[PDB]
């Protein structure tokens, strides 16, 4: 096992200390240099630039070489464990946690490297294309007439209901059935103090949203999934309460003013009935969708961007949030998106991407996907698929057959990250498209 590799590495380090520049036999040193090398390897495991000072040049070189060897052995063991992860081959109970921790530290190092690359290097968001997307969102809002977010004052009736609902959700998520922790007691106490003092809690949350422009250390936790991991993050309790408050407020305001269209809407319904039935009936309810006598053809495009996280323009995020929400809550959301990241020992870097674990994240991802949909589908196609704000259409309906007969696209869907398209097109457009 890996214990034999570690023992061989320790023996190699001893042999190097004995032969690789021992400074002559004059009552030389002992395994304290081995302790220094182990501490240096542990420091490097945090992806920090720390090293093993307090020694000569070849001693440090041998220490770095042995550390690289041990790290290569660890990465190989992790790769072998990840190979027997999808199938598993009836993995034991102890190996699972070790492989999960190894993969977690590897991903922490990778995220630190990505943040360092975004900092030192300049992988911007196509500033010309960025201004283009901003102008497109501006025209979309102007055409839809969706007013911005009127940030909550202390003079609203149903705000107490929203606060109680947030407390109920946080309590249902925190303690399901006989579960508590050192910090979970803090969450229960905060929920109780909110249920007792809702006015003071709402005032404090308003103070946070108006003034608090920072955040504390958010931890990382990987869900024990086989194929695709679900990284769950930790947050602060009062920060969580304020997050749920302004999140639910944004949801209510969007549902009231129709800030989102129907296609980008995993929403109030069950996924299979809405998705399958509406999608298939729209495929069937089209204007002669199945007619192929004139050489027509149909195509279905299903994919997933795989870039709704870790590749987003945070500055453009703040710009769009200011375009659609007031400066206070928008800046607070932009700050919380890149607040902090902390591993078991490491300290991951912010300003690299969105923190999906933080509350009010679904609004952000859906708005990002809405911007991308306005970019891809365009203006006229979206203006015809949605309809006017005075008389919009259903999930797959139209004001008239001409609204769909003009453009090639007829139906569209979108999940949190998925996407589905169905478009008919004649043979002339087919030949032109294949020529291109």
């Amino acid at each position: 096992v890996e214990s034999h590799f570690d023992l061989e590495l320790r023996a190699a380090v001893m042999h190097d200390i004995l032969d690789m520049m021992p400074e002559g036999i004059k009552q030389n040193k002992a395994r304290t240099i081995l302790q220094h090398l182990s501490e240096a390897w542990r420091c490097w495991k945090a992806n920090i630039p720390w090293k093993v000072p307090g020694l000569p040049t070849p001693i440090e070189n041998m220490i770095l070489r042995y550390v690289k060897a041990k790290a290569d052995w660890w990465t190989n063991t992790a790769h072998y464990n990840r190979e027997r992860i999808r199938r598993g081959a009836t993995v034991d109970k102890t190996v699972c946690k070790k492989n999960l921790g190894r993969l977690t530290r590897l991903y922490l190092k990778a995220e630190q490297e990505r943040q360092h690359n975004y900092l030192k290097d300049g992988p911007y968001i196509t500033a010309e294309e960025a201004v283009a997307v901003y102008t497109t969102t501006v025209h979309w809002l102007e055409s839809r007439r969706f007013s911005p977010i009127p940030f909550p004052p202390l003079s609203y009736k149903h705000d107490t209901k929203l606060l109680i609902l947030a407390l109920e959700r946080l309590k249902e998520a925190y303690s399901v059935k006989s579960r508590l922790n050192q910090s979970q007691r803090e969450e229960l106490g905060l929920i109780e103090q909110a249920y007792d003092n809702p006015h003071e809690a709402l005032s404090r949350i308003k103070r946070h949203l108006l003034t608090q422009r920072a955040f504390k250390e958010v931890g990382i936790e990987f869900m024990d999934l086989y194929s695709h991991l679900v990284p769950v993050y930790d947050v602060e309790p009062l920060e969580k309460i304020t997050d749920a408050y302004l999140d639910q407020y944004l949801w209510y305001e969007a549902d009231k003013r129709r800030l989102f269209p129907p296609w980008i809407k995993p929403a109030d319904t069950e996924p299979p009935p809405l998705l399958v039935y509406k999608w298939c009936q729209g495929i069937n309810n089209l204007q002669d969708v199945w007619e192929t006598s004139e050489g027509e053809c149909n195509v279905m495009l299903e994919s997933r961007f795989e870039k709704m996280y870790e590749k987003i323009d945070l500055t453009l995020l703040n710009r769009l949030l200011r375009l659609i929400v007031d400066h206070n809550i928008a800046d607070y959301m932009t700050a919380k998106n890149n607040v902090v990241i902390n591993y078991k020992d490491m300290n991951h870097t912010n300003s690299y991407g969105i923190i999906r674990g933080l509350q009010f994240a679904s609004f952000i991802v859906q708005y990002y996907g809405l911007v991308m949909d306005l970019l891809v589908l365009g203006l006229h196609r979206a203006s015809e698929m949605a309809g006017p704000p005075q008389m919009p259409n259903d999930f797959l309906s139209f004001q008239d057959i001409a609204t769909e007969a003009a453009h090639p696209i007829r139906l569209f869907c979108r999940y949190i990250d998925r996407i589905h398209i169905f478009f008919r097109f004649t043979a002339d457009e087919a030949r032109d498209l294949i020529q291109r």
Partner: peptide
């Protein structure tokens, strides 16, 4: 190494 591993895991 790390890229393909983190992509397929």
């Amino acid at each position: 190494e790390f890229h393909k591993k983190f992509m397929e895991k």
